[PDB]
C-alpha cells in the first residue's frame, strides 16, 4: 500500500 | 486522501485471465476464419476501440457471436487476446506483420506503436 | 520471450470503472440494506473470495440480484466497490471498523491486512 | 514496454  | 494497493490492477487482470482459461462467465465468441475465441465483452471493450464501439451499440451489445473481417489472421488475434488478459505480447519476426494489422483493426494503439517501432529497427 | 506493457492492467481497470460509472454491461445489482449497487460479476469475482464463490455456483451464477447479510453497512460496501474498480481505498478513522468488517465478509484479504495494520497503529 |  502507498500514498498515490 | 485514499491509500493505494500497487498490485491490485495486475491481480484483477490475472483473475480475469483465470476465469477466461476456465471458460467462467465468458459471454461472447469471436469468430476469426474457422477459429473461435471465447471472452468477456467487458475485457474486450477495455482493451480495444473496435470492441468498445461494437458492444456500446444498442443492437450488437446483445450478440453472443461476433465475426471478424476475413482478412484477420487467427494467430494474430490469439496473440492480441492473450495480451488483453495478461499485458504480455508475444511479438516475433514471423508474426509482427499479422499482429500489427490485427492491432490496427482492433484499435489497440499501444500495440500498433510498439509494432511500428520494432519494424523500424529491422 | 514476450514484451510487457507496464500500464496495461491499470488502463484495463480504469476502462472497467468508466463502464461501471456509465452503467455499461453491468450484469448484477448488489443489495445492501436499502441501497443498491450495480456492477460487473467478473470484476466482483476477481476482487472478492465471497463473489468468486457466489458466481461460480451453478445456480447463483444466473442471479441478477444478490442480497448481502443485513449486518453489512452500505458505506463500507461502497468504499470497497470503489477500491475494486480503482485500487484506491478511502480508509478513514470514522469508517475503518465498517470497512474491515465488510472486507472480512467479502474475503478481500489485502484490505483486511491494511485495516488490521492501521487499527494496531492507533 | 519492458522485458518482464
Ligand atoms: O487503443 C485503444 C484501447 C481502447 C479502449 C477503449 N475502451 C474504453 C474507453 C473508454 Cl473512454 N471508456 C470505456 C472503455 Cl471500455 C476505447 C478505445 C480504445 N483505443
Ligand atoms: O482476497 C481475495 C481476493 C480473491 C479473489 C478471488 N477470485 C479468483 C481467484 C481465482 Cl484463483 N481465480 C479466479 C478468480 Cl476470479 C478468489 C479469492 C479471493 N480472496
Ligand atoms: Cl493497446
Ligand atoms: Cl484485497
Cα C22 to chain centroid, rounded: 17
Pairing of strands B28-32, B65-67: parallel
Paired strand residues for C31: C36, C67
Whose Cα sits closest to atom 2 in ligand 1? B108
Domain ranges of chain C: 1-122
* Inter-chain CB proximity A2 and B2 less than 8 Å: no
B46: region left, alpha or beta (phi > 0 left; psi from -120 to 50 alpha): alpha
Report CA B50 to chain centroid distance, whole Å: 10
Number of helical (H) and strand (E) elements in chain D, helices listed first: 0, 0
Contact at 8 Å (CB) between B41 and C25? yes
Contact B42 C42 (CB under 8 A): yes
How far apart CA B107 and CA B25 sit, in angstroms, is: 25
- Give phi and psi for C48, each to the nearest 5: -135, 130
What is the per-residue DSSP string for chain C? --EE-TTHHHHHHHHHHHHHHTT-S--EEEEETTEEEEE-HHHHHHH-HHHHHHHTSTTGGG-SEEEPPTTS-HHHHHHHHHHHHHSEE---TTTHHHHHHHHHHHT-HHHHHHHHHHHHH-
Q: From residue B97, how far is each of B1, B47, B75 by CA, in Å?
A: 46, 20, 11
- Cβ–Cβ < 8 Å for B54, C25: no
Sheet arrangement for strand B28-32: B35-39, B28-32, B65-67
For atom 13 of ligand 1, the residue with the nearest CA is C15
Domain spanning C1-122: CATH 3.40.50.1370: no
How many residues does this entry show for chain D? 4
Spatial distance between the Cα atoms of B47 and B42, rounded to a whole number of angstroms: 9
B66 phi and psi angles, rounded to 5 deg: -125, 125
Torsion of CA C9, B17, B46, B2, to 10 degrees: -40
Q: In whole angstroms, what is the distance from residue C35 CA to residue C78 CA? A: 10
* HSE of B50, CA atoms in CB hemisphere, 13 A: 15
Q: What gap in Å lies between CA B39 and CA B97, rounded to an integer?
A: 24
The span from the CA of C56 to the CA of C48, in Å, is 12
Q: How far apart are CA C48 and CA C63, in angstroms?
A: 17
Question: For residues B78 and C84, what is the distance between their CA atoms, to the nearest angstrom?
Answer: 28
Residue B24: alpha-carbon gap to chain centroid:
17
Contact C44, C37 (CB under 8 A): no
Residues B18 and B12: their CA atoms lie apart, in Å, by 10
- List, in sequence order, every beta strand (DSSP E) within C24-112: 28-32, 35-39, 65-67, 88-89
Question: Measured in angstroms, how far is the CA atom of residue B85 from the centroid of ligand 1?
Answer: 15
Angle between helices C96-106 and C109-121 (to 10 degrees): 150
CB B36 within 8 A of CB C56: no
**What is the distance between the alpha carbons of residues B68 and B32, in angstroms, rounded to a whole number?**
6
C-alpha cell of residue C10? 491499470
Which of C4, C10, C12, C13 is the best mutation test for B, with the most CBs of B within 10 A?
C12
Residue pointed to by grid coordinates 487499527: C119
Contacts with C, D 1-4, CB within 8 Å? 1-4
Amino acid at each position: 500500500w502507498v500514498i498515490p | 486522501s485514499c491509500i493505494q494497493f500497487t498490485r491490485h490492477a495486475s491481480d484483477v487482470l490475472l483473475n480475469l485471465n483465470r476465469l477466461r482459461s476456465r471458460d467462467i462467465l465468458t459471454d461472447v465468441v469471436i469468430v476469426v476464419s474457422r477459429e473461435q475465441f471465447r471472452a468477456h465483452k467487458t475485457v474486450l471493450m477495455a482493451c480495444s476501440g473496435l470492441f468498445y464501439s461494437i458492444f456500446t451499440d444498442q443492437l450488437k451489445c446483445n450478440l453472443s457471436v461476433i465475426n471478424l473481417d476475413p482478412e484477420i489472421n487467427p494467430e494474430g488475434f490469439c496473440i492480441l487476446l492473450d495480451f488483453m488478459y495478461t499485458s504480455r505480447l508475444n511479438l516475433r519476426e514471423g508474426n509482427i506483420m499479422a499482429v500489427m494489422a490485427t492491432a490496427m483493426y482492433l484499435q489497440m494503439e499501444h500495440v500498433v506503436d510498439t509494432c511500428r517501432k520494432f519494424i523500424k529497427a529491422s
